[PDB]
Design a protein around this ligand. Structure first.
Ligand SMILES: *[C@@H]1O[C@H](CO)[C@@H](O[C@@H]2O[C@H](CO)[C@@H](O)[C@H](O)[C@H]2NC(C)=O)[C@H](O)[C@H]1NC(C)=O
Ligand SMILES: *[C@@H]1O[C@H](CO)[C@@H](O[C@@H]2O[C@H](CO)[C@@H](O)[C@H](O)[C@H]2NC(C)=O)[C@H](O)[C@H]1NC(C)=O
Ligand SMILES: *[C@@H]1O[C@H](CO)[C@@H](O[C@@H]2O[C@H](CO)[C@@H](O)[C@H](O)[C@H]2NC(C)=O)[C@H](O)[C@H]1NC(C)=O
Ligand SMILES: *[C@@H]1O[C@H](CO)[C@@H](O[C@@H]2O[C@H](CO)[C@@H](O)[C@H](O)[C@H]2NC(C)=O)[C@H](O)[C@H]1NC(C)=O
Ligand SMILES: *[C@@H]1O[C@H](CO)[C@@H](O[C@@H]2O[C@H](CO)[C@@H](O)[C@H](O)[C@H]2NC(C)=O)[C@H](O)[C@H]1NC(C)=O
Ligand SMILES: *[C@@H]1O[C@H](CO)[C@@H](O[C@@H]2O[C@H](CO)[C@@H](O)[C@H](O)[C@H]2NC(C)=O)[C@H](O)[C@H]1NC(C)=O
Ligand code: NAG
Ligand code: NAG
Ligand code: NAG
Ligand code: NAG
Ligand code: NAG
Length: 646
């Protein structure tokens, strides 16, 4: 009507920063046949506006001059995705016909007025992504026809009103990302039509109401990242339409209720980061639909039940960081769909089962810091789908080249501190995307296959603390992405290859405790990320090359326990980031260069058991050094443990 159109024009005249490419260019002629046919966002019935849809039209303004008293037949209102600021007036509750009300994604502030509860015909209320604060008024519980309430991502405080139990037609309730507090009212459990209940990321406390067992149609229950406490009520097992139950990151205590096995529809169960204790009920194996079972970071004890072999759709099983113990039953890995088996930081014992990867789809197997032992099952040898294998801290045994097959998509493997023996196979080269190869402190013997240096995506290679023999070839330069190279504590012999000079991504190089002989390559001068170099405990000889002083990021340089001789270069002053320097147990002669006074970052120095003489340079490391950093030298003199200088 002319009066509705004139009133909307007056509201429009108040908008700011309007671009004249606005859709509202079409708001000109208030007569019908303009108003009801060509005004953007306006739809009428019998010449009167019943729908106002200005979503995402770049309006900046407020509702201060919104014409509440001029639009009596307003039925559908969508003002979302604009730049409306200010508050939500009580006058919005005078639109008696309103069915659909959306002010989301604006910059609205202040409290929700109780008058919204007067909208007795409302079907949908959306106020998401604003900065609304205060408590939800209890009068919202008068919206007896509403089927969806979404007020997520606001600044709401206070409890969820008990009056929400009167919202008998409510289907979806989305209140996540707020600061709602108090206990969940038990009246929520008596909403017969409820399908989705999302109260996650709030500050809710107290126990989950046992009334939730009356929620026979709820398919989604998200209440993660709250402060819920007490035990999960056994009545939850009567939510027999649940597809997804997420209670993670709460303060729940006591046992997992055995009645969860009653929920045959349940596909996703997230209970991690709680304080759940006791044994995993064997009835959890009856959750026939379960795909994604995550109960890590709890205080569960006892063994995993054999009934886990009945979970035939299982894909992800997260149990890390519990106190589970004992042997694992073959059923734990029996799902042909299993892709991730995550058991780290428990106290499991015995062998891996022969069911593992029987479906040919297992990807991530992580077992760190358990007590597993025995040989690798042949079905894991033959598991071509593996991406991540983490066995650190267990005691697996067997010949390493018999235990493992070929893994084309392997990305990361850590076998540190296991008990594997044998020689490395060239088969590892078929993991062309492998970025970390960690085999520290096994009983590996024999040579490094030359194919290893063709694993050009390697970023970490750690074969330390084995009994590996042979010489490093010049083609070591081919692992040109390597950033951490740890070959320490082996029996490698021959000269250190010059090709390491081309490993310009190297950050950390440990070749120590080997039998390397002859000179340190004089071309190691161009490793601009190298902060750690350890060549100690070898048989390296001749002079320390000046190229090492160009390794400007070095923080630690350890060349101790070699037969290096000649003088310490005064160009060491160039290592301005050097904190720790160990040259002890060598055959170095002459004076410690006075240029060490330039190295203000040095904190630790050891030159003991050399053939050095003369006074000690003036820097803090030398002043703070204990007598044994100097002992065993020829004629050092001081101004500790040294005779004073003349
Ligand atoms: C638009 O609103 C007007 C004003 O409320 C409605 O007109 C009234 O209709 C009632 C019927 O409930 C009549 O008895 C009155 O004579 C009208 N009042 C006035 C002040 O004109 C109109 O029906 C509404 N139109 C639509 C399509 O909802
Ligand atoms: C909701 O937000 C408003 C706006 O920041 C808060 O309003 C302030 O309230 C205090 C005390 O009630 C007054 O002293 C200020 O002058 C108010 N500021 C404005 C801009 O109105 C309001 O307190 C908040 N409500 C809650 C419960 O936090
Ligand atoms: C591994 O899973 C299979 C099913 O995928 C289990 O085999 C079924 O066992 C039940 C007995 O409870 C029989 O009624 C079915 O006929 C079996 N199906 C097939 C295809 O054999 C097997 O028991 C599971 N193994 C373990 C160790 O849990
Ligand atoms: C059972 O497993 C737990 C977790 O893996 C072990 O606890 C760790 O023990 C080491 C060594 O004492 C500590 O450095 C860690 O801080 C502990 N981690 C945690 C998360 O507590 C525990 O030692 C194991 N029990 C036995 C008998 O080995
Ligand atoms: C098994 O672990 C790997 C991590 O190494 C997962 O792969 C990564 O997934 C993210 C997506 O979340 C991708 O952006 C990365 O590119 C993937 N990395 C690699 C190396 O592929 C993989 O999704 C896990 N498997 C399952 C079923 O969760
Ligand atoms: C360089 O590596 C050697 C091992 O090859 C580290 O040696 C340790 O040194 C301390 C004191 O010198 C001894 O108490 C340890 O017993 C040594 N360990 C071994 C396994 O021999 C040395 O610490 C490393 N240097 C730096 C700076 O990290
Ligand atoms: C106009 O727009 C800019 C940013 O959109 C803002 O700084 C200014 O406050 C706006 N309106 C005014 C000053 O009325
Ligand atoms: C408003 O228009 C958008 C885009 O056409 C549409 O997706 C939305 O459902 C409309 N809302 C109403 C209440 O008409
Ligand atoms: C709505 O709930 C309140 C308690 O919050 C109750 O007093 C009232 O009677 C309920 N509604 C009806 C129609 O009774
Ligand atoms: C689990 O927690 C309760 C206290 O909340 C305690 O009574 C019980 O002994 C705990 N330990 C178990 C069940 O092993
Ligand atoms: C491997 O190192 C661990 C500590 O990391 C040590 O306790 C263990 O004895 C080493 N391996 C063997 C076989 O001794």
């Amino acid at each position: 009507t002319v009066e509705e159109a004139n009133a909307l024009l007056k509201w429009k005249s108040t908008f700011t920063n309007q671009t004249s490419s606005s859709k509202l260019s079409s708001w000109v002629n208030p007569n019908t046949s303009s108003f009801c046919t060509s005004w953007y966002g306006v739809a009428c019935s019998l010449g009167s506006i019943i729908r106002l849809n200005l979503t995402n039209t770049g309006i900046e303004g407020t509702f201060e001059d919104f014409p509440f008293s001029s639009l009596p037949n307003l039925t559908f209102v969508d003002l979302s995705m604009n730049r409306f600021s200010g508050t939500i007036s009580p006058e919005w509750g005078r639109f008696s016909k309103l069915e659909y009300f959306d002010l989301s994604i604006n910059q609205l502030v202040g409290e929700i007025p109780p008058e919204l509860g007067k909208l007795s015909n409302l079907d949908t209320l959306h106020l998401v992504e604003n900065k609304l604060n205060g408590s939800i008024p209890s009068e919202i519980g008068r919206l007896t026809k509403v089927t969806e309430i979404a007020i997520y991502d606001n600044l709401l405080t206070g409890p969820i009103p008990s009056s929400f139990g009167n919202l008998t037609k409510l289907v979806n309730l989305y209140l996540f990302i707020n600061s709602l507090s108090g206990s969940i009212p038990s009246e929520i459990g008596n909403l017969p039509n409820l399908r989705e209940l999302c109260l996650d990321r709030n500050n809710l406390t107290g126990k989950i109401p046992s009334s939730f067992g009356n929620l026979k149609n709820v398919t989604l229950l998200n209440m993660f990242e709250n402060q819920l406490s007490g035990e999960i009520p056994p009545e939850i097992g009567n939510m027999t339409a649940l597809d997804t139950l997420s209670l993670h990151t709460n303060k729940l205590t006591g046992p997992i209720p055995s009645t969860l096995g009653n929920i045959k529809t349940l596909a996703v169960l997230h209970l991690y980061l709680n304080q759940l204790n006791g044994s995993i009920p064997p009835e959890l194996g009856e959750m026939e639909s379960m795909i994604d079972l995550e109960i890590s970071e709890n205080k569960l004890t006892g063994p995993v039940p054999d009934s886990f072999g009945k979970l035939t759709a299982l894909e992800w099983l997260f149990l890390r960081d519990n106190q589970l113990s004992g042997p694992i039953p073959p059923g734990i890995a029996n799902s042909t769909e299993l892709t991730v088996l995550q058991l780290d930081t428990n106290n499991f014992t015995g062998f891996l089962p022969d069911t593992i990867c029987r479906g040919g789809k297992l990807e991530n197997l992580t077992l760190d810091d358990n007590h597993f032992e025995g040989p690798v099952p042949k079905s894991l040898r033959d598991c071509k789908s593996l991406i991540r294998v983490r066995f650190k801290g267990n005691s697996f045994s067997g010949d390493i080249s018999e235990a493992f097959g070929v893994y084309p998509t392997l990305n990361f493997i850590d076998l540190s501190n296991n008990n594997f023996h044998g020689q490395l196979s060239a088969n590892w080269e078929q993991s062309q995307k492998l970025v970390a190869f960690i085999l520290s402190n096994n009983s590996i013997t024999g040579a490094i296959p030359p194919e290893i240096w063709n694993m050009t995506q390697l970023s970490q290679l750690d074969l330390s603390s084995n009994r590996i023999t042979g010489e490093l070839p010049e083609s070591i330069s081919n692992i040109n992405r390597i950033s951490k190279l740890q070959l320490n504590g082996n029996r490698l012999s021959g000269k250190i290859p010059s090709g390491i000079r081309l490993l310009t991504n190297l950050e950390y190089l440990d070749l120590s405790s080997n039998r390397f002989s002859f000179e340190i390559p004089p071309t190691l001068n161009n490793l601009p990320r190298l902060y750690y170099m350890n060549l100690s405990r070898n048989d390296l000889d001749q002079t320390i090359p000046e190229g090492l002083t160009k390794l400007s990021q070095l923080q630690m340089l350890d060349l101790s326990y070699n037969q290096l001789d000649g003088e310490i270069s005064s160009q060491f002053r160039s290592l301005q980031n050097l904190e720790r320097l160990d040259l002890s147990h060598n055959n170095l002669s002459g004076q410690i260069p006075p240029s060490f006074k330039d190295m203000l970052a040095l904190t630790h120095v050891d030159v003991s058991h050399n053939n050095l003489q003369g006074p000690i340079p003036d820097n803090a490391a030398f002043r703070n050094a204990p007598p044994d950093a100097f002992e065993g030298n020829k004629d050092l003199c001081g101004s500790q443990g040294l005779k004073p200088c003349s």
